[PDB]
RNA sequence: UGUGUUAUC
């Protein structure tokens, strides 16, 4: 801190004025400074003069150098931040060229500054605030290259793209979603632990859910195409995202989501049915598959219920069967025991059993009495284990 | 008995 601006005790001076420090050309010291900046945050919330907020403009967001400076600063890009909603709210004859000078400044800038930890955070501030055309220029300086997947792993510019995501309207990001939908760009950012809640929220905002019911219809044919096209490269690549660490939500998320329904059956017929068994013993794709039990339509169901019961041969030498192996394995387990929970909600009336025109409750009275049948065969071996004293309690419960 | 994301003075 200048000099001037101290005490006798080498601290910052208390009653020292905005105007003081506007009109000493320091300002630049005090925003970078945690008590001078303290200072400024403080005093530019109060009432200014048409003259103090001239000078702000003209020190904080005026210059490309100094605005990156202050930007990319730890304490200055909160006082970036207010000093672009005061511009935003001061309708004098500066406006237009104050917000493009904002926009060319950030936009000549946007990789870098949506990569820095502080600067991200006055990226995501002008999207949400400055005006719509403006805002729209700003995603239009996102890289097209690999820095795009830089951003969207990053743990600081994944929160652009989500920022992006949230309050532009799609027109303006489709080439994000193209991008994504790439083979080898869609394998990179699923596979990421910042990357996939990028496409997760993506493909959030391109649902057609009760948070989109006022789009226009020509928005929602727009929405519509964008995430037929992503939802074809994640089908294509659904074996390798549902096993994999961070991707698996994304599957689980489609999956779930009735919204998706259409979706969800591709998912489930293109990499789940006839991979059950093997998918049950994985640690990632074990959650797919519990979330595809439980979602799936009553014709798929069946076909996945009659998979584990008897889509299988069992050891030649053994007899031990794919459900005997579920049932004890560490993550089949987990699979069995939501088998159990569907059939007795089911039967008990906690779950719909008609769809597709038909009551289906003979089904899953089928289905339980097979489980019932082998967990009370198997009893002594299962209540060695927290799992198989589980689905006693459950079947124990029902009874009751 | 089994996984992540939700980040600044």
Not at 161 to 171: D, E, H, M
Request: hydrophobic share 40%; with cysteine.
């Amino acid at each position: 801190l200048p000099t001037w601006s101290l005490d006798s005790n080498g601290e910052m001076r208390s009653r020292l004025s905005l105007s003081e420090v506007l009109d000493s050309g320091d300002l630049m010291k005090f925003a970078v400074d945690k008590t001078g900046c303290q200072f400024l945050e403080k005093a530019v919330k109060g009432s200014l003069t048409s003259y103090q907020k001239f000078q702000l403009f003209e020190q904080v967001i005026g210059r490309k150098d100094d605005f990156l400076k202050l930007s990319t600063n730890i304490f200055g890009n909160y006082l970036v931040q207010s000093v672009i909603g005061i511009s935003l709210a001061t309708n004098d004859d500066g406006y237009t060229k104050r917000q493009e000078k904002l926009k060319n400044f950030i936009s000549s800038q946007m990789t870098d500054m949506c990569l820095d930890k502080f600067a991200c955070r006055v990226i995501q501030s002008s999207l949400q605030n400055m005006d719509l055309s403006l805002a729209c220029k700003l995603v239009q300086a996102l890289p097209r290259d690999a820095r795009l997947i830089a951003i969207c792993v990053d743990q600081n510019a994944n929160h652009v793209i989500q920022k992006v995501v949230a309050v532009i309207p799609l027109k303006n990001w489709e080439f994000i979603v193209d991008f994504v939908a790439t083979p080898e760009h869609l394998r990179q950012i699923c596979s990421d632990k910042y990357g996939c809640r990028v496409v997760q929220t993506i493909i959030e905002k391109l649902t057609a859910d009760s948070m989109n019911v006022d789009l226009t219809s020509a928005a929602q044919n727009l929405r519509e195409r964008a995430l037929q096209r992503l939802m074809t490269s994640v089908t294509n690549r659904c074996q390798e995202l549902a096993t994999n660490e961070y991707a698996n939500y994304i599957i689980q998320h489609i999956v779930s989501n009735d919204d998706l329904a259409v979706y969800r059956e591709c998912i489930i017929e293109k990499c789940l049915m006839r991979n059950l068994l093997s998918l049950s013993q994985e640690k990632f794709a074990s959650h797919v598959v519990e979330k595809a039990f439980l979602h799936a339509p009553l014709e798929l169901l069946a076909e996945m219920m009659d998979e584990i019961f008897d889509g299988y041969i069992p050891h030649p030498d053994t007899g031990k069967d794919a459900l005997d192996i579920m049932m004890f394995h560490q993550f089949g387990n987990y699979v069995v025991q939501c088998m159990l929970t569907i059939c007795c909600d089911a039967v008990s009336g906690r779950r719909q059993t008609k769809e597709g025109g038909y009551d289906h409750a003979i089904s899953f009275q089928d289905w339980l009495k097979k489980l019932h049948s082998r967990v009370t065969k198997e009893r002594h071996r299962l209540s060695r284990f927290s799992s198989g004293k589980k689905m006693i309690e459950t079947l124990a419960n029902l009874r009751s």
